[PDB]
């Protein structure tokens, strides 16, 4: 089996976590523990009941130089009642480390006498949003020498009150910053947290649920009349092994299927208007390669899971975020360097953006010179 010992902490650590009574890891420390040592940032899915307080304190307690005394660590929280939860677990698996003083800081404590703590050396904060952001700004709180921090129930700290504050947070922190982020739900919120800010992070308990990782994606400025013209020639310019084209309407679906059919290109297309044996059939000799290119709306439900298709096209432009993510994401099994592409109206602009900030990523425009090692 697996044991602590394996991970290679500290004596005084290993002692003080083998006091609260912790003999063998649970799963998501066994996952995120040899991880977070490592530098990787995580982001992972895990139920409020924490639980996952554990997870990522004994790495955090471990990457700690107590010849320094800056803060060298943070952990967030959203509720005052959670702080005083994960800050006496991180004191009790701490009493063997020589020195290691954690400040507990929250709405509900006196702000005063801990502007006057903070004179002193701390190197571990446990905070909610508000008063952390109140004693940085301030200057009490010397946060320049952070190499970790920690996002607990970051649906609740990514909501719309807490999430520009949760911003400016890390504004005040280094470049390079590990961050470990642990949530319950998977909105679109954490998408932008992670899209934003997060570095190649680790994904546990992630598989089935979508994410632009790997997808290069760009955006041309054209009309409904010149759309076909643009796509002619990224069938011409692009080196594609399979495709895949979503429009707004099997009407235009196929309507496209036929004009494109009739320039000496191969596809075939499927939509909502069709019998389900026969899409399956189609879906099916697609993913056989008897074609390179598909014509759909949004039928799926899934993640697009085949893994010759290294381009996506977006004909007619979504209005919602979520549709964008389902044609373009991955479900985490299948990371290729998949291009992403979308034929923009004017329309389309306030959406382009909207989408744009809302998954908290960048949408470039198309170099004509696309390099092929991006796919």
Known sequence: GNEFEDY?????????????????????????????????????????????????????????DLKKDNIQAMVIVPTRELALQVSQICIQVS?????????????????????????????????????????????????????????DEADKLLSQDFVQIMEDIILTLPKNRQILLYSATFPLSVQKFMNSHLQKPYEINLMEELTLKGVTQYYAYVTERQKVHCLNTLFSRLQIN??????????????????????????????????????????????????????????????????????????????????????????????????????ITYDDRFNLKSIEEQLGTEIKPIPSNIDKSLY
């Open 8 to 64: 290679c902490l500290k004596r005084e650590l290993l002692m003080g976590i083998f006091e609260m009574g912790w003999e063998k890891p649970s799963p998501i420390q066994e996952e995120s523990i040899p991880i977070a040592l490592s530098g990787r940032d995580i982001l992972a899915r895990a139920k409020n009941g924490t639980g996952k307080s554990g997870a990522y304190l004994i790495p955090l307690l471990e990457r700690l």
């Open 242 to 343: 399979q495709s895949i084209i979503f429009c707004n309407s099997s009407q235009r679906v196929e309507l496209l299927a036929k004009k494109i059919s009739q320039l000496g290109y191969s596809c075939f297309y499927i939509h909502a208007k069709m019998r389900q044996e026969h899409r399956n059939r189609v879906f099916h000799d697609f993913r056989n390669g008897l074609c390179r290119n598909l014509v759909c709306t949004d039928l799926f439900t899934r993640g697009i899971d085949i893994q010759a298709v290294n381009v996506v096209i977006n004909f007619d432009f979504p209005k919602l975020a979520e549709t964008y993510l389902h044609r373009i994401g991955r479900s985490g099994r299948f990371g290729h360097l998949g291009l992403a592409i979308n034929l």
């Open 95 to 151: 009493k063997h480390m020589g020195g290691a003083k954690v400040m507990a800081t929250t709405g509900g404590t006196n702000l005063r006498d801990d502007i006057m703590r903070l004179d002193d050396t701390v190197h571990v904060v446990i905070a909610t949003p508000g008063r952390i952001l109140d004693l940085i700004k301030k200057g009490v709180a010397k946060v320049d020498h952070v190499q970790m921090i920690v996002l």
